[PDB]
Design a protein around this ligand. Structure first.
Ligand code: FAD
Ligand code: FAD
Ligand code: NAP
Ligand code: NAP
Lengths: 445, 445
């Protein structure tokens, strides 16, 4: 018989479990699945907590979400393929669900799946080794509930431990003497803290955009964002100037590359994350940049230096839930032997290279979206996963992109066509800038 | 030769290296020494950084110190018996040096000791296992300069990783929703942030004492401190007040056991730390409360379930630097063979029980001080550690305590007798509450 260890109970690990349970429904025998989760409850990033730094058990807080956060993409872009919205909420909702709403939705199908009984919560994995003679992986985990660490052999390890949790926190001259709050996005929690204040937001990507907005919505005196590469470029509110790279701080004085100046009360470092695995030896440890074509993963899921070990979700993410399903099915199939991996490490490296180069062929954002779209499509064709209208996802993604470039601060006040009934979403009872309440029930009436 | 691995290059780990160096200079054979240090530099808690949470490498920030921190005790009670403050600084400085100053003193000693060549920085330990059949420990460490993990065998392991870095962070009702800053002391860095605010300081121990005082010195609008057991009991300033146990928060308003009420702008959790070792298996992982009689440590230093493993600094601390020394010399001598461990585990366990029982014989403060004094005497008598006036050091704490009950806010404007000379240190050039500059240059003029 076989046993498989899944590290993480975020959307990815959860997707993996759904994958095995699905095959077992159909009538397939499956190996024992053990899923280790560090937190007390499933949901990965979506499992919000006020904590920052180390959690109550002393482990580093995984959560990177803050209050007042709504879906960054239209929900129509992420709608599951085996369980849809209305089926869980009963009704049609607006196009940008708040965190709680989406968490409840993520919760919906996982509960319905009866997978929870596979998850060991409060159980950070401490280490994973591979013995070539047994052909077994040895996972080592600490059970916080009983304060005891133990070890166990598995035939496979599927690492679903995320990569938007270990922050890149760069030092700039003046940071250690700045008389104000300096915080990475991983630790940002409540925008009310910056009400009436002058915020500096470093970065030009998703977090800078959304965290900047949050603080604008909740009353910052002003927003200053700064880029080091391409500006976010959107049409910013009155209190929002975008500026070139920081040189240094002197007091509360930000000096920028164009010689200009601004005094700010607070700095939110929206400078991204690293793929970091504290629990992996060199010959298992994935090392890569954040991007659509992840180094060292054949088919974007199988570890080239040891193909009995897998990784989910390690790509940068235009597509999310639907991708992790596509990935999890594939990894499932490879484990059940419906799919046979190459024994030729050269050829697995070839596959990665090809992905990298194709990814690099164009820098246009619609090309990039389309690209991960072709990826999902690739995967879904190679397993019994329900083929679905991905191009329909893409078309939503394209409308999204036109709404943000249109009016960055109102883009969440739009609706998009559904992909299962082509029916364009209703509007929300309330405008985003007015919708100060965050709660699920406020959203749902 | 034998090899010994030292975990940590703070004061205890550094004391341990000095110990081994001193022995070898005198011409005793010594095992090879490898000291693994997480941080970029030595210093342990005294190596300050602005960072909180995870460090530039993704490892948890060890630092628990803040800006404007000064020695909370008389420098007289911690002076290296083999390296006087006079030998280092050349003159005679006041009794409560700022962080930077004592840091330079710690570094001064290991400078002269030429032991830095033994230290591997940016190299946190990942794991320690013992194998009884080879009678060697296996140490897995990760080198962030080469981003490479490796494993090596050692005949002894001396863990000096400290226990004031992994915080105890309780949940109280309303923490999830408080409109303001909630920060544990371990993440606290700059008191200026609290200028003008009604601060809530939870706790009644050293941390709440000092951090509350920093907040007040640097202009907090008001301080409220709450206890769950015994009030701190000091004659506080007029804008400072102690309340019984917090029950909950409602918006910005705190509720205490006495049914009273106060609105607060920020909460600093000075609720302490845990003994936490993310890198040890059940069979080597010290588990103990923070006190003077540490559990499962023979002579306060040798893990009783495997006495080839030792631990430094795990006790609560009145005495600090020279205790670390006594311990370091002891452990050294036990490893060299100048001391023999009891063949009977019952004996080691017996030794720990008598220490607990004697710590518990009385709850009076002077008696605790004397108790730790006796431990240092006990240890010192068994090695060739330089003798030094322990009683005198003890009288320094007795006067220190007196000065604190007399004036909790000025106790640092005081001098004490050198354990070597007997004469009162010079007065510093500025009252503490006015000494806003904490630099080593301002201090030494
Ligand atoms: C701030 C933020 C906002 C986002 N918003 C959106 C959005 O609106 N829409 C969208 O589609 N996508 C969004 N994403 C993308 C997000 O990554 C995915 O939606 C999804 O949460 C990732 O799935 P995952 O399970 O692979 O990663 P994670 O959600 O990070 O799951 C990893 C899980 O593994 C666990 N784990 C980690 N290490 C260990 C260990 N050693 N032992 C045991 N368990 C461990 C963690 O507890 C965690 O629960 C957002 C990401 C971030 C950072
Ligand atoms: C806020 C605060 C203020 C204090 N002020 C004073 C004072 O004024 N006077 C005084 O006498 N005492 C003070 N103390 C007590 C303090 O514990 C000692 O001064 C001293 O720092 C103890 O030294 P140590 O080496 O035992 O522990 P630490 O100083 O904590 O040293 C531990 C070292 O081990 C390293 N380490 C940890 N884990 C790993 C790993 N897995 N791999 C590799 N390396 C690792 C850490 O990076 C760290 O450098 C204070 C303590 C605190 C928390
Ligand atoms: N529904 C979703 O899937 C969803 C969408 C939004 C966010 N996200 C995911 O998470 C990622 C985006 O979140 P993110 O913004 O937090 O990460 P990020 O994409 O890596 O953005 C990092 C930003 O910080 C800048 N930066 C990095 N290091 C810096 C430094 N040392 N100094 C100054 N600036 C620096 C970057 O500039 P440079 O460009 O020059 O590096 C970049 O603008 C996406 O890639 C995405 O997959 C999830
Ligand atoms: N050389 C010196 O100047 C000097 C002298 C005195 C002490 N010390 C040292 O410095 C250390 C103290 O630092 P510290 O104050 O940060 O830690 P600490 O001594 O453990 O103090 C913790 C405080 O928080 C309280 N607390 C703990 N858990 C709580 C919870 N869940 N809810 C509410 N309150 C809670 C404690 O109350 P309870 O007591 O009820 O648990 C205590 O008041 C000691 O370990 C000691 O070594 C130094």
């Amino acid at each position: 018989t076989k046993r498989v260890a899944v590290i993480g109970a975020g959307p990815s690990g959860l997707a993996q479990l759904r994958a095995f349970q699905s095959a077992a429904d159909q009538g397939a025998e499956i190996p024992e699945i053990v899923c280790f989760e560090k937190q007390a409850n499933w949901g990965g990033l979506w499992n919000y907590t006020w904590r920052t730094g180390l959690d109550e058990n002393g482990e580093p807080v995984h959560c990177s979400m803050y209050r007042y956060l709504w879906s960054n993409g239209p929900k129509e872009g992420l709608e599951f393929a085996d369980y849809s919205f209305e089926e869980h909420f009963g009704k049609q909702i607006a196009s940008y669900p708040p965190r709680a709403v989406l968490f409840d939705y993520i919760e919906g199908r996982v509960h319905k799946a009866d997978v929870r009984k596979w998850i060991r919560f409060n159980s950070p994995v401490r280490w994973v080794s591979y013995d070539a003679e047994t052909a077994k992986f040895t996972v080592t985990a600490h059970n916080h509930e009983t304060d005891s660490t133990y070890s166990a052999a598995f035939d496979h390890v599927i690492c679903a431990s995320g990569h938007f949790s270990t922050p890149n926190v760069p030092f700039y001259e003046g940071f250690d003497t700045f008389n104000g709050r300096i915080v990475h996005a991983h630790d940002f929690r409540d925008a009310r803290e910056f009400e009436g204040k002058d915020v500096l937001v470093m970065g030009a990507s998703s977090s800078a955009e959304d965290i900047g907005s949050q603080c604008w919505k909740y009353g910052a005196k002003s927003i200053t964002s700064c880029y080091r590469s391409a500006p976010m470029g959107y049409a910013w509110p009155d209190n929002w100037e975008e500026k070139p790279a920081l040189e240094k701080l002197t007091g509360k004085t930000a000096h920028f590359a164009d010689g200009s100046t601004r005094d700010v009360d607070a700095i939110i470092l929206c400078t991204g994350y690293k793929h970091f695995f504290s629990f992996l030896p060199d010959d298992l440890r994935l090392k890569t940049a954040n991007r659509l074509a992840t180094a060292d993963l054949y088919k974007g899921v199988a570890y080239v230096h040891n193909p009995a070990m897998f990784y989910l979700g390690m790509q940068d993410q235009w597509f999310t839930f639907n991708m992790f399903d596509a990935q999890a099915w594939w990894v499932r199939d490879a484990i059940l032997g419906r799919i046979t991996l190459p024994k030729d490490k050269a050829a697995m490296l070839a596959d990665v290279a090809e992905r990298e180069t194709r990814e690099e062929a164009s820098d246009d954002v619609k090309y990039a979206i389309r690209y991960q779209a072709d990826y999902v499509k690739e995967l879904v064709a190679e397993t019994d996963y329900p083929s679905f209208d991905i191009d329909g996802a893409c078309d939503a993604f394209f409308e999204w992109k036109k709404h943000k470039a249109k009016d960055i601060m109102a883009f969440r006040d739009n609706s998009y066509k559904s992909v299962i009934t082509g029916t364009m979403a209703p509007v929300h009872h309330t405008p985003w800038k007015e919708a100060l309440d965050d709660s699920m029930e406020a959203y749902l009436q």
